[PDB]
Amino acid sequence: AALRPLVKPKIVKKRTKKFIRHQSDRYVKIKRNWRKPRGIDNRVRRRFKGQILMPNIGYGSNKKTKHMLPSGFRKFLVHNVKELEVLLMCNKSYCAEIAHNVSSKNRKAIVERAAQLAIRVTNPNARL
Amino acid sequence: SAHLQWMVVRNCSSFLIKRNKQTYSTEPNNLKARNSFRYNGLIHRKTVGVEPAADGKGVVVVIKRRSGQRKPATSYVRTTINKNARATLSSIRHMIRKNKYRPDLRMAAIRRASAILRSQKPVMV
Amino acid sequence: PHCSRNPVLVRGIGRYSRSAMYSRKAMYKRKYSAAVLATVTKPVGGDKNGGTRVVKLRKMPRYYPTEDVPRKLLSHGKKPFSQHVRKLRASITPGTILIILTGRHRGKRVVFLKQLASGLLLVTGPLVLNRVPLRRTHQKFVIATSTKIDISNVKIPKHLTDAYFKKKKLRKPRHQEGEIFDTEKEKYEITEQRKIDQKAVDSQILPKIKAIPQLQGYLRSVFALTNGIYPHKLVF
Amino acid sequence: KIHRRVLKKNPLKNLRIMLKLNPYAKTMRRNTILRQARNHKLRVDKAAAAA
Amino acid sequence: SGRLWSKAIFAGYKRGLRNQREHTALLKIEGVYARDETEFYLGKRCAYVYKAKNNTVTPGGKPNKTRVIWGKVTRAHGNSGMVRAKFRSNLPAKAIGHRIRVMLYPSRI
Amino acid sequence: NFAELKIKRLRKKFAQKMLRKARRKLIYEKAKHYHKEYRQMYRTEIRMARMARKAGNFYVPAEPKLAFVIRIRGINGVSPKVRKVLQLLRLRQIFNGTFVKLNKASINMLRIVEPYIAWGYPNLKSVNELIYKRGYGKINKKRIALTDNALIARSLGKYGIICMEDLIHEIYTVGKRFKEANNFLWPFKLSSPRGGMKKKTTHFVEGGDAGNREDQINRLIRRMN
Amino acid sequence: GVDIRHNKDRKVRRKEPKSQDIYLRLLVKLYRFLARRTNSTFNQVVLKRLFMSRTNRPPLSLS
RNA sequence: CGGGCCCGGGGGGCCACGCGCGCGUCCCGGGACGGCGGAGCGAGCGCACGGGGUCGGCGGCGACGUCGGCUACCCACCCGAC
RNA sequence: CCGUCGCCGGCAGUCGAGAGUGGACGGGAGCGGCGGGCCGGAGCCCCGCGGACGCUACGCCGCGACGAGUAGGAGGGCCGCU
Ligand SMILES: [Mg+2]
Ligand SMILES: [Mg+2]
Ligand SMILES: [Mg+2]
Ligand SMILES: [Mg+2]
Ligand SMILES: [Mg+2]
Ligand SMILES: [Mg+2]
Secondary structure: OOOOOOOOOOOOOOOOOOOOOOOOOOOOOOOOOOOOOOOOOOOOOOOOOOOOOOOHHHHHHOOOOOOOOOOOOOEEOOOOOOOOOOOHOOOOOOOEEEOOOOOOHHHHHHHHHHOOOOOOEEEOOOOO | OOOHHHHHHOOOOOOOOEEEOOEEOOOOOOOEEEOOOOOOOOOOOOOOEEEEEEOOOEEEEEEEHHHHHHHOOOEEEEEEEEEOOOHHHHHHHHHOOOOOOOOOOOOHHHHHHHHHOOOOOOOOO | OOOOOOOEEOOOOOOOHHHHEEEEOOOOOOOOOOOOOEEEEEEEOOOOOOOOOEEEEOOOOOOEEEEEEOOOOOOOOOOOOOHHOOOOOOOOOOOEEEEOOOOOOOOOOEEEEOOOOOOOOOEEEEEHOOOOOOEEEEEEEEEEEEEEEEOOOOOOOOOOOOHOOOOOOOOOOOOOOOOOOOOOOOOOOOOOHHHHHHHHHHHHHHHOOOOOOOHHHHOOOOOOOOOOOOOOOOOO | OOOOOOOOOOOOHHHHHHHHOOOOOOHHHHHHHHHHHHHHHHHHHHOOOOO | OOOOOOOEEEEEEEOOOOOOOEEEEEEEEEOOOHHHHOHOOOEEEEEEEEOOOOOEEEEEEOOOOOEEEEEEEEEOOOOOEEEEEOOOOOOOHHHHHOOEEEEEOOOOO | OOHHHHHHHHHHHHHHHHHHHHHHHHHHHHHHHHHHHHHHHHHHHHHHHHHHHHHOOOOOOOOOOOOEEEEOOOOOOOOOOHHHHOOOOOOOOOOEEEEEEEHHHHHHHHOOOOOOEOOOOEEEEEEOOHHHHOOOOEOOOOOEEEOHHHHHHHHHOOOOOOOOOHHHHHOOOOOOOOOHHHHEEEOOOOOOOOOOOOOOEEEEHOOOEEEEEEOOOHHHHHHOO | OOOOOOOOOOOOOOOOOOOOOOOHHHHHHHHHHHHHOOOOOHHHHHHHHOOOOOOOOOOOOOO
16 A cells, blocks of 8 residues: 555665674773774774674675665655655655654645655654 | 756756755756756757646646747747546657657656646545 | 477487488478568448547557566576476375375375376375375375375276366455454365265275275374384385 | 676586587487497397396 | 474584584484485475464464474585584574474475 | 668578578588597507507607696795796686696796696596686686687687687697687686595695696596586 | 786776866767777877876977 | 598498589599589478576465564573683 | 776667668669569558657766785765864
């Protein structure tokens, strides 16, 4: 009953865990987002066995499923009704997303316009 | 010239929307709304555009004259087709194929005009 | 139309060579030199609607989709399931006793009838012995024992295709919301056609089971593994 | 015209890939299949004479 | 009636000495202790049947609380029985030294 | 106009079919000829040996002339004169066979690489199975699988090699255009030897792998490609 | 691993003009088409000289 | 179980041998062999070890309890880890 | 499968009518295969008026080889802050 994508390939992720920064567990001052370890004795940088894995380009996802939502679509961010019609001809491979700033009165009109224009909206329940 | 104007508006344009890993374009006579040299409703000597009508019945086919390329008040001639869905498609098909008026935007004008009529059908829950 | 005139040695190699087959076909004398509808006319609904209407069938579509999918390349193999060649394991000849390994009738000892068209094995337990009726069963979920009954001079009815045993469907004509619970059609009932084909086949299999001694009690027991036996050491 | 990658098949296992490279391989093959069945029928005549 | 599967032990994963590869398990089937004795088992379906807290669905019955991880015996490992087995999801290490069923499905007898 | 342009189109597709069936018959008869020529060679070595045993004499065969080298030792810690010789044989990676032509220039540089290569004298079955299973070409510096004879004939065709059977005869009977045929082959990529190496680090005649095992290299090729 | 060196793999060479001049970029499209679809090696010389820097492209006097 | 397209002349197997005229060479008027001559294309069915997978094959289960989904949620075990 | 490098790779032919390993003619002389009464010869598409996608050319498509790295160099950043 939902709008279906055009095709739906099997999406294969080469890795599903995030890359945490080395020693982000040991400290609150170290946040988890990644910094490349530059240090002369670092056993993460030197890639010992049993350590934290470093991100590199080999983990890159298959570029016909890249940026694909887990239900076949790709995401486009919208703010008002008149930039929703750029998805009129991208119907079965891109889905609209009302941005966070758009008020409750105005995202009524985006939802029913996209319903009569066959565009899937990812968050059509946001001030209800 | 269409190429010389394209080298200006390729990356710098008010109609150009660049958000997450995809680019769109919002100029009026643009089928597909894609930022492309073939589909651009401003730079070519002859363009095709289709839009919904004044009220929600029909499609407005707008084409571009030969003559007044620097006269924007009179450069476009607008036609409202309000047939059934099958013969409004053979109408747009004849305006492109029989005149040889820009016959690469032909099927893109049919995909848009079919999808613009399905928007006008009464929605069922 | 003649036969192939070229016997096979192995698959994809004929026995007779290229010029040898020029002369078996007599191609030296058998050689040769040189050499809708889409629109109908349909009559008038007049008067002064003058002229018949030329109307085509195959009209043009009312709605193209937004995007299409490009078509595939070509494959040169890859037949449908109805055209696969059927293989039967060399242990299994008509009349052997099978040990059903998988269904509701796990462990039963049934007697193998004809093999059907879709590769499935038409099997009967004698229903009077172990309550397995005429069913299909799959080849690779079945152990062939070495015990044989001569089912030559036994007439299997010819309306016993794959379509005879295929399950039946009804749901769901004209019902759209789930409030009315329906306790019908999930009960299977035996038809009279199903019930007398069993009697037509048990009538002539049973005199050959009562022929050899104590095959009956063998065909009434179920198979099992105990603390001794290991199946790589058993003899089937 | 797009020439994509042709999957390399083994002519030592796939017969019509061998015949596309060596058409004579069919003629060797029918000569060695017939020669091995002619010698095999000739050795079960030696066995069916000295018995 | 009757057991109808052959009983095997989950020994460990396919491993070196200081590396283990959890995608391939190592099984010891009771009764076979030589590599020439193991050709019977080389395509056989195999299951790890265990119980958990919540109910799950049962194909052919009401919801039990048994759960199954299915696998296949792929090849032999070593010179004394010891097949290795490929499961659909990798076996939990809780299972090491417990029962794995070996099933007699797809048959070649 | 329009009917005459079909008939000129159907006759140029007819000449190409006639040219195609003439070229298929050429490579058919070249391979029937080479089959005779290999029986010429193989039976002659037996007859020359038998006529010497009758007279109480010895027949020393021809010193062989086709070798097949295989790099057995990897790329870590290799001395520079040895490292330069291995990249003149195109052995840049471990298990990377190629054919070489034996003479005094090539034998004295195979002695420089004794502990890195294993080599010997291949037979006709070994040169068939390497070309068919693992023979790729160097076609404008790409590595192209030899899936059709037009790939061989477009490069080596000016030397007379127009099918894969001619290429095998040019390698095995080390002909006048051996150099261009061997260099056409991208050097081979063999797997690890199935069943083990029996002590890689030492010479074949003292229990290992290095150097010249002479016709036992054929026993190595079977379990490696 | 292979025994090769990688320091001269990427060959340093112009393959487009570095300028953003749109009349220059527009007759690069003309000569890149003419260098592809023609056997002429004149067009392959003129194409790469359009790529060049000003100091690799000096003034030619009338004399 | 040599070579000479198994030289050639005479008296069961194999052949990727198969139009006629017209010239050529060779052999015993007859042949055989030609890469030789100025003149236009066979058609239709199938089958496939043939430029990378398909089925024109199938079964079971289902709203107050199950189905799938989840990670900087928690816990457990094996292995690795200063 | 991801990237890089190489192919000075391909695509402006969106050419459902585009089509050429040369083509036209235009008389001089002729064949076959067509329409015999031994005399003689163009079909310029269409019963269907129709036939997916593409080419942000700073784009898109292909093919092959390749991928350790401190100090250091260089590029890309639809990474982020004012
Ligand atoms: Mg250090
Ligand atoms: Mg239990
Ligand atoms: Mg070392
Ligand atoms: Mg490096
Ligand atoms: Mg690196
Ligand atoms: Mg650094």
